[PDB]
Amino acid sequence: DLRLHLLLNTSVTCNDGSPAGYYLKESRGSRRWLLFLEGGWYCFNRENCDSRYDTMRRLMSSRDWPRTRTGTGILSSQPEENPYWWNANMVFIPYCSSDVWSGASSKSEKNEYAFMGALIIQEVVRELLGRGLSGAKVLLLAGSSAGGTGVLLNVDRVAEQLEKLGYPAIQVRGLADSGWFLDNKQYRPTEAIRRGIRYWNGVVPERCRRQFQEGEEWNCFFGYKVYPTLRSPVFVVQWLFDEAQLTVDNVHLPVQEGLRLYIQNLGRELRHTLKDVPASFAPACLSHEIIIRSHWTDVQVKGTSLPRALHCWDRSLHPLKGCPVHLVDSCPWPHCNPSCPT
Ligand SMILES: O=C1CN(C(=O)COc2ccccc2)CCN1
Numbered sequence: 168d169l170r171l172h173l174l175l176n177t178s179v180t181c182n183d184g185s186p187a188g189y190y191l192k193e194s195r196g197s198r199r200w201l202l203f204l205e206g207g208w209y210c211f212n213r214e215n216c217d218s219r220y221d222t223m224r225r226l227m228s229s230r231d232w233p234r235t236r237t238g239t240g241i242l243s244s245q246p247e248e249n250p251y252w253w254n255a256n257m258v259f260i261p262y263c264s265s266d267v268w269s270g271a272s273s274k275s276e277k278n279e280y281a282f283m284g285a286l287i288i289q290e291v292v293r294e295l296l297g298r299g300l301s302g303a304k305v306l307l308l309a310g311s312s313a314g315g316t317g318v319l320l321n322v323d324r325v326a327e328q329l330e331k332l333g334y335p336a337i338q339v340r341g342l343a344d345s346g347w348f349l350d351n352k353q354y355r356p357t358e359a360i361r362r363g364i365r366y367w368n369g370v371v372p373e374r375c376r377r378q379f380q381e382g383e384e385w386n387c388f389f390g391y392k393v394y395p396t397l398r399s400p401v402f403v404v405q406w407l408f409d410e411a412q413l414t415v416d417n418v419h420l421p422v423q424e425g426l427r428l429y430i431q432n433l434g435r436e437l438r439h440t441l442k443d444v445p446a447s448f449a450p451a452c453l454s455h456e457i458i459i460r461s462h463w464t465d466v467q468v469k470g471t472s473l474p475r476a477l478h479c480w481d482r483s484l485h486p487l488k489g490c491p492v493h494l495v496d497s498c499p500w501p502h503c504n505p506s507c508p509t
């Protein structure tokens with residue numbers, strides 16, 4: 168069980184002004200720290216956020232959060248469930264800012280909601296330094312879905328924050344799960360992100376911002392465009408036929424030729440964007456499943472599981488015989504990999 172701590176700086180808030188926070192389980196015999204960002208879409212205007220507040224309020228407020236949560240998958244402390252990092256210090260950061268972890272805007276007389284995702288990450292890091300993070304050797308910033316995109320937007324800022332605070336020995340790395348999307352043509356989204364950035368006062372990594380310039384920061388929410396600008400090591404996990412990608416593409420699964428070609432082209436394009444990503448795990452599956460699920464160990468690419476690939480990545484940051492880190496399926500249709508989830 169991970170225990171809840173509400174932020175001591177109560178000006179760093181969820182959407183409705185309640186304090187943000189984190190769940191923590193310490194492991195005093197370990198110098199490894201895993202900070203995981205939750206996902207759950209976003210909202211981009213007053214009316215859309217009001218609807219989310221009625222029926223997804225835990226994603227907008229801490230008022231009803233439980234005092235504990237169970238760590239599962241990569242957050243589990245059991246070796247059988249988590250062969251990778253079972254002995255690590257574990258942190259789960261709830262997503263209560265509805266801004267893909269990009270915002271830096273407080274509630275005020277002109278803003279009904281606060282969008283503070285980027286500041287929540289910074290304040291969690293600062294408060295953890297007094298609870299053992301000051302002695303860390305590795306800080307892995309991980310996340311799923313909107314949290315996976317959040318890793319790409321925030322990993323370099325965490326590295327810069329720790330350097331400026333006086334902790335240059337902590338190696339900051341990222342793990343982005345299910346947050347690598349394509350701005351492709353639909354079978355039958357970029358505008359919502361553009362509007363969101365203005366509504367949230369959203370921030371993007373500085374090198375990417377300088378490439379795309381004013382008004383075009385939305386480009387930095389797409390992994391294939393932001394990843395080449397990042398300095399921290401980042402491991403990318405992405406299903407080739409991600410269900411959220413298909414949803415935004417208006418695809419809902421007797422498949423005729425037009426849809427067959429569309430699905431095959433999508434897998435080929437995703438595979439192409441990962442060609443120059445040396446640490447990656449991309450199975451040919453139709454799924455919405457994420458790395459905090461208990462059975463995350465089951466899927467394999469070319470005979471190698473994700474916990475193994477992550478271990479090989481750790482070794483590479485000290486190619487390796489029998490320990491691969493670039494694992495992208497080449498077969499062209501959902502479930503052509505026999506180990507895909509059901
Ligand atoms: O499959 C899912 C989808 N979810 C997401 O957050 C979608 O991912 C993103 C990533 C970036 C921006 C918007 C959405 C959570 C619920 N289960």
Ligand SMILES: *[C@@H]1O[C@H](CO)[C@@H](O)[C@H](O)[C@H]1NC(C)=O
Pocket residue numbers: 176178179286
């Ligand atoms: C609390 O956080 C806000 C936003 O980052 C910051 O302006 C303020 O200085 C912080 N307060 C303290 C006491 O650190």
